């Protein structure tokens, strides 16, 4: 599917423009495109096909190069970082197999209840062991190339979007709704503007929105 | 990729030849190829990409038919039937409905050999059945492996598979291991050319259910690699 590809292109338009207006230091960290060649190399290294919206994203910016995280402090990873980190996570998963905290999913059964999986491709890092990424091996009630949280502190994994496009666009919409604060042009942090609320960790916001969405949809069967 | 495809072509040459020599009745049940068009239709229906060795298999035989009968079909894999593409689509859909009903609901312990190679669940939308016992059990291709499995590994699943088993690395390797069993003489042809059943010739072993043979081989292999 080219599902999310349009959403990806739109989101990058908003984010490119928003950073140029409000945070030119952040704007200047957004790397040049990957080549198709770059992508093919990575896909061959990892023995994976990147979903269409992820490849579109890479052909707009090859991550960030210093670098303070674009996603409210979380860094968009370069393709080399994606390869290296996927390999690192693959080593983890092999070590857990060589020797064999409750791993869980929201929604239940959408994401495999495991600490690490070779087919979870990290695209964003908090540089503390946590990721947002694309799940190429969903659980029985998940979707192929759904966007999840995983890593060191994600004993519970969350489905935060249906595809990379929808995820980027939801972030672009947060910027556009004024859900931000600048603490240099300064560090980008999240706040809920409409509620005049405090600064929040973006992971906690994502997890809360996933909960709310799941709860609101449960009545439907 | 070019992983299992060659093994698939080779396996079908041996299986085509073995059936023609030893069991022409069985041979004649092997259907004509799917067209690329047939495959594209099915892939669009299911919203999946069939691995390369599975597509190659479909372009050699579209399962087993045996339309000239009135009492079931003699399954190629020691009684288990190779499913037609229409049967694969329909049964995938059926299994997907099962998995949806288990999601809608609030089934003993689901497990895997090797551990964590297969998701510990009763049904998954990405398990594509290719072989049936026509009693709810399947051999198929796992397009959503667990953390210690491989993409497009060949698994057992269904009604009686609370424990799922990885029985081959790809469809090619699976077909070839079956071809090798034929060639080693691991069979009897029982009648009222007769029904194809498994027996370990060199050990002078009893007739065995092929699922049990597969499960035992997987166990042994897992134990010997740990």
Task: Provide DSSP, B73-104.
Answer: --BTBTBBEEPPHHHHHHHHHHHHHHHHHHHH
Q: Tell me the Cα Rg of chain B.
A: 17
* Residue B85 distance to chain A (closest CA, Å): 23
**Residue B21 burial by Cβ neighbours in a 10 Å radius (0-12, 13-18, 19+):** exposed
**DSSP β-bridge partners for residue B127:** B142
CB contact under 8 A, A141 and B99: yes
Cα separation of A104 and A107, whole Å? 9
Q: Is A146 on the interface with B (CB under 8 A)?
A: no
Collect all residues with Cβ–Cβ distance below 8 Å to A158 and sequence separation of at least 6: A105, A106, A111, A148, A149, A206, A207, A210
Q: CB of A126 within 8 A of CB of A177?
A: no
C-alpha span between B154 and B151 (Å, rounded): 9
Looking at the partner chain, which of A109, A117, A118 has a beta carbon nearest the beta carbon of B103? A109
User: What are the C-alpha distances in Å from B106 to residues B67, B99, B196?
Assistant: 43, 13, 43
Strand order in the sheet with B81-82: B81-82, B127-132, B137-142, B153-158, B163-168, B111-113
Tell me how far apart the alpha carbons of residues B121 and A118 are, in angstroms, rounded to a whole number: 19
The pair phi, psi for residue A99, each rounded to 5°, is: -120, 80
Asked whether the beta carbons of B57 and B84 are under 8 A apart, the reply is no
Q: State yes or no: cis peptide before B18, omega within 30 of 0.
A: no
Interchain CB distance below 8 Å, B115 and A137: no
Q: How was this structure determined?
A: X-ray
Residue B133 phi, psi dihedral angles, 5° rounding: -90, 5
How far is residue B100's CA from residue A108's CA, in Å, rounded to a whole number?
13
The β-bridge relationship of strands A156-161 and A104-106 is: parallel
Tell me, yes or no, if B164 comes closer than 8 A to chain A by beta carbon.
Answer: no
| Nearest partner of A95 among A66, A70, A115, judged by Cα | A115
Q: Beta-carbon neighbour count of residue B131 at 10 Å?
A: 23
* H or E element, residue B175: helix B171-183
Instruction: Give the distance from CA B174 to its chain's centroid.
Output: 8
Report the length, in residues, of chain A. Answer: 221
B99 touching A, CB under 8 A? yes
Cβ contacts of B97 within 8 Å, gap of 6 or more: none
Which of B218, B219, B190, B216 minimizes the C-alpha distance to B203? B216
Say whether residue B155 is in contact with chain A using an 8 A CB cutoff.
Answer: no
The count of structural domains within chain A is: 1
Count of residues in chain B: 226
B63, two tokens: 């399962």
**CB contact B101 to A (< 8 Å):** no
Most distant CA atoms of chain A, gap in Å:
52
Give residue B4's region: left, alpha or beta (phi > 0; psi -120 to 50): left
Burial B70-99 (b: 16+ CB within 10 A, else e): eeebbbbbbbbbbbbbebbbebbeebbebb
**Residue B99 distance to chain A (closest CA, Å):** 7
C-alpha distance from residue B92 to each of B85, B99, B142, B222 (Å): 10, 10, 12, 28
**Cβ contact B124–A140 (<8 Å):** yes
Question: What domain range is A24 assigned to?
Answer: 1-221
Q: Are strands B163-168 and B111-113 parallel, antiparallel or unpaired?
A: parallel
Q: Please, how many CA atoms are within 13 Å of residue B98, restricted to the half-sphere of its CB?
A: 17
A117 contacts on B by Cβ (under 8 Å): 146-147
Chain B partners of A97 at a C-beta cutoff of 8 Å?
A: 115-116, 147-148
Sign of the C-alpha dihedral, residues B206, B209, B210, B213? negative
Experimental resolution (Å):
2.2
Mutate one of A140, A159, A218 to test the B interface: name it (highest B CB count within 10 A): A140
Sequence-ordered list of residues with C-beta below 8 angstroms from that of B202, at least 6 positions apart, any chain: B184
Of chain B residues 4-33, which have a CB less than 8 A from chain A? none
The two counts, helices (H) then strands (E), for chain A are 7, 9
Question: Cα(B47)–Cα(B65) distance, rounded to whole angstroms?
Answer: 25
Nearest CA of chain A to the CA of B156: how many Å? 16
Chain A residues lying within 8 Å of B125, measured CB to CB: 140
Given the structure tokens 């994203």, which residue do they identify?
A: A57
Rounded to an integer, what distance in angstroms lies between the CA atom of residue B56 and that of residue A155?
41
B102–chain A Cβ distance below 8 A for any pair: yes
**Distance between CA atoms of residues A21 and A150, nearest Å:** 32
Chain B contact present for A117, CB below 8 A: yes
Kindly state whether A137 is in contact with chain B, defined as any CB-CB distance less than 8 angstroms.
yes
Rounded to an integer, what distance in angstroms lies between the CA atom of residue A118 and that of residue A124?
Answer: 16
Place of tokens 């869980």: A104
| CA atoms of A121 and A133, how far apart (whole Å) | 5
Residue spans of alpha helices (H) in chain A: 5-22, 24-29, 36-46, 52-58, 79-98, 164-176, 202-217
Q: Is A143 on the interface with B (CB under 8 A)?
A: no
State the Cα–Cα distance between residues A117 and A124, nearest whole angstrom: 16
Ramachandran sector of residue B147 (left: φ over 0; alpha: ψ -120 to 50; beta: rest): alpha
Beta strands across the sheet bearing A181-182: A181-182, A188-191, A199-200
Would you call A126 helix, strand, or coil by DSSP? Answer: coil
SS3 (DSSP) at A146:
strand
How many CB atoms neighbour CB A200 within 10 A?
15
CB A58 within 8 A of CB A9: no
């Amino acid at each position: 599917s080219n599902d999310g590809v349009s959403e990806t292109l739109l989101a990058w338009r908003h984010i490119d423009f928003w950073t140029s207006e409000h945070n030119p230091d952040l704007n200047a960290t957004l790397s040049d495109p990957c080549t198709q060649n770059d992508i093919t190399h990575a896909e061959e290294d990892l023995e994976v096909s990147f979903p269409n919206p992820v490849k579109a994203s890479f052909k707009i910016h090859d991550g960030q190069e210093d670098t303070s995280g674009l996603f409210y402090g979380f860094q968009l990873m370069t393709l080399d970082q994606v390869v290296a980190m996927t390999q690192a996570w693959r080593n983890v998963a092999k070590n857990l197999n060589k020797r064999s905290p409750d791993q869980k999913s929201i929604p239940p059964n959408a994401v495999q209840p495991v600490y690490a999986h070779p087919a979870w491709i990290p695209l964003i890092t908090d540089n503390a062991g946590n990721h947002i990424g694309v799940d190429l091996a969903p659980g029985p009630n998940g979707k192929y190339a759904q966007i999840i949280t995983f890593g060191r502190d994600f004993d519970t994994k969350f489905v935060i979007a249906e595809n990379w496009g929808e995820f980027l666009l939801s972030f672009a919409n947060d910027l556009e709704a004024g859900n931000w604060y600048l603490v240099g042009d300064g560090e980008l942090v999240f706040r809920d503007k409409k509620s005049n609320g405090p600064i929040q960790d973006y992971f906690e916001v994502l997890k809360r929105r996933t909960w709310i969405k799941y709860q609101l949809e449960r009545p439907h069967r």
